[PDB]
Structure formats: C-alpha cells, structure tokens
Design a protein around this nucleic acid. Structure first.
Ligand code: 8DG
Ligand code: MG
Ligand code: MG
Length: 314
DNA sequence: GCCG
DNA sequence: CAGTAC
DNA sequence: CGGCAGTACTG
C-alpha cells in the first residue's frame, strides 16, 4: 500500500482522461492499482515488467521516476487540462462538451454560467457544483437511505431497500447514495416509481431530477438530487433503482461495485463463455440465464471464491 | 496505456 | 444516433 | 491486430 510512483502516474491518467483518451487512461488506472497493492517498493525495471498491468512502457516510466526523481512527461501536460477538468466536473458534461466549451474560449465557470448553452442536467450540475464534489459522512448516507426506505415501506411493507455503492463497501464517506429496491413477491416492485417519487416530492426531500423517465411504466432508475431537512445540510446526489426479485443478486452485485471490480468480473465471465450484467449472469449467445439467488451464486458459477463488499473496493 |  | 451516466 | 463491460436516459 506504499508507492511514490503512483502519485506522478495519477496526474497523467487524469490528463488523458479529461482529454477523452479513455483507453490510455484505463491502462494507467490499472497500472496504478497494481502498484498500489504490491507489498515491496518496486525497484528493478525487471521487477516492474514482471507485474501484470505493467508493460514495457509503464516500466520505463517507473525506472525514470526511480533513476531521477521525476517524470518528464509531467512537464508537458496540455495547458487545457485544468479547465477541461473544471468543466467535466459539471454533472451531465463530459469530455466532448468540455472540449467544445474550451474551443469556444471559455475558461471558468463564470464563462459557462454567463455564455455557455447548458442542458437541463448541466444547469443542475452547475448550480450544485461544490456540493456534488463533496463526499458525505456515511452517517448522512444512512439518513438518506432511511428516508427513502420509510417512503417506500409506507406504500408496501414488504419492499426491501439496501444502500449499495461505497456505503455497502464500508467506506467512511460516500460520493452519493445508491438505493436498490425490490420485492420478494416477484411483482409488487412494478410501477412504484410513480408512488415513491411523488411521496419524496410531497415531503420536499427531492429538489431536482436528472434522469427520470416517468412516462415509461418500465423506468429503471431515478437519478436526482435530495436534501435532508434542517440547518447545515447540503444537496446530495441520490440514485434509486427498482428491480424484480429474480434479478436481485445481480443488481446488488452491480450497484455495489466498485466500477473496476464489476468491469473485471464481467471481463472474466466473458472468458468463460458467460455474460454478466445488472440483470443476470447468462451463457453467451441466444444465451441462457442461470439462477442466481444470492451474490455467492454469481461468485460460485464463475469459479471464484466469494468476496465481502469491503474487498471489492477497487 | 494493458493484454491476448 | 452521440454523449453521459450508473 | 484490436478489445478494453454492459446497460439506461436525453434530445
Ligand atoms: N460511477 C460509475 N459507477 C459504475 C460504472 N459502471 C458500473 O457498473 N457502476 C456501478 C458500480 C458503482 O459502485 C455503482 C454506483 O456508482 P457511484 O458513482 O454512485 O459509485 P460508488 O457509490 O461506488 O462511489 P461514490 O458514489 O462514493 O463515489 O454503479 C461506471 O463506469 N461508473
Ligand atoms: Mg461531468
Ligand atoms: Mg455512489
């Protein structure tokens, strides 16, 4: 858990990421993970090369940081990167939009606010800019889960509500709250976004909607914004997903993450003639859905030993 | 960027 | 669809 | 050479 190479490599990874070089940024992210969980400090080029996730090129960069104290490429990062990061930290704006605003001459959030064309989602990101960069204490994520759960349960007592994401992975702070709802009755989950969201609105808890297709009877997710009542409260991102019970174990696995963990698990299923999504684990193609009543069944069918959510925190 |  | 998001 | 996870809204 100790390295001084990763500090330098993260700056590069983030730069490629905000410039839209998503594959290169992915190679970096994994290299960093490998470096992060190596016992020893890495000392030989030979030793770097030996690691999975670390190729010829990553090894040369490591040998440079060791040999000298620096990575020369860090001196040549595009001058646009800090601005592109500023702009892609607006919820609903990504690298393409950031790059366009840059090309148009914008350089600050004041330029965005006064001159840029914003989508509805972006106007909401912008207005909650600081809040959405903050992580909340896990105790607050608890209160948010409980607000959602009380609202759901009032409608139907048998509804099951579990906070997922970082919260379920045991983290002390959380970027937002992700709540998964199902019903062991196989049926009653259907159509409730109507009732649940209307309830949470009546209380004034939800302050804005980001993604909510409420014209569709088969809406899967709500992504939006909430604020607990009373003084000293900030706006928080809230994600709610409602899933049939047969999909509960796959939904829980998915929504718990981490994102890297899921990508890795899916890559791996794929090497075994299988396919893993938030809905199911299947044979590959028309494939067959396999029965997965618990997360442990997903692990077992992939030939892997179970991992507690706290150990998925890649 | 990494890997098969 | 492209972009963005989980 | 070429995948790199698989899927859900928006406009
Ligand atoms: N953010 C993100 N989440 C993903 C992706 N793919 C994916 O399956 N997920 C799942 C795994 C995440 O743990 C889950 C919830 O997303 P999230 O952004 O709220 O993630 P989180 O709770 O783990 O982290 P955080 O909010 O505390 O920052 O959605 C992805 O590419 N990005
Ligand atoms: Mg953004
Ligand atoms: Mg989260």
């Amino acid at each position: 858990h100790n390295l001084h190479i990763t500090e330098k490599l993260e700056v590069l990874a983030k730069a490629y990421s905000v410039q839209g070089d998503k594959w290169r940024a992915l190679g970096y992210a994994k290299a960093i993970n490998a470096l992060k969980s190596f016992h020893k400090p890495v000392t030989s080029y030979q030793e770097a090369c030996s690691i999975p996730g670390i190729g010829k090129r990553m090894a040369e960069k490591i040998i440079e940081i060791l040999e000298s104290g620096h990575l020369r490429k860090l001196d040549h990062i595009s001058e646009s990167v800090p601005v592109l990061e500023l702009f892609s930290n607006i919820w609903g704006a990504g690298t393409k939009t950031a790059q366009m605003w840059y090309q148009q001459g914008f350089r600050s959030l004041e330029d965005i606010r006064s001159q840029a064309s914003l989508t509805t989602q972006q106007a909401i990101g912008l207005k909650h800019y600081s809040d959405f960069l903050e992580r909340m204490p896990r105790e607050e994520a608890t209160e948010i889960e409980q607000t959602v759960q009380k609202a759901a349960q009032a409608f139907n007592s048998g509804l099951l509500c579990v906070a997922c994401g970082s919260y379920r992975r045991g983290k002390a702070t959380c970027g937002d709250v992700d709540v998964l709802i199902t019903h062991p009755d196989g049926r009653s989950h259907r159509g409730i976004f109507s009732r649940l969201l209307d309830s949470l609105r009546q209380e004034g808890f939800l302050t804005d909607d980001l993604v909510s297709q409420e014209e569709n009877g088969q809406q899967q997710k709500y992504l939006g914004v909430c604020r607990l009542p009373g003084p000293g409260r900030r706006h928080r991102r809230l994600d709610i997903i409602v899933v049939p019970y047969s999909e509960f174990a796959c939904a829980l696995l998915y929504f718990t993450g981490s994102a890297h963990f899921n990508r890795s698990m899916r890559a791996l299923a794929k090497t075994k003639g299988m396919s893993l999504s938030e809905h199911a684990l299947s044979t590959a193609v028309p494939g067959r859905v396999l029965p997965t009543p618990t997360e442990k069944d997903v692990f077992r069918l992939l030939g892997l030993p179970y991992r507690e959510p706290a150990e998925r925190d890649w």
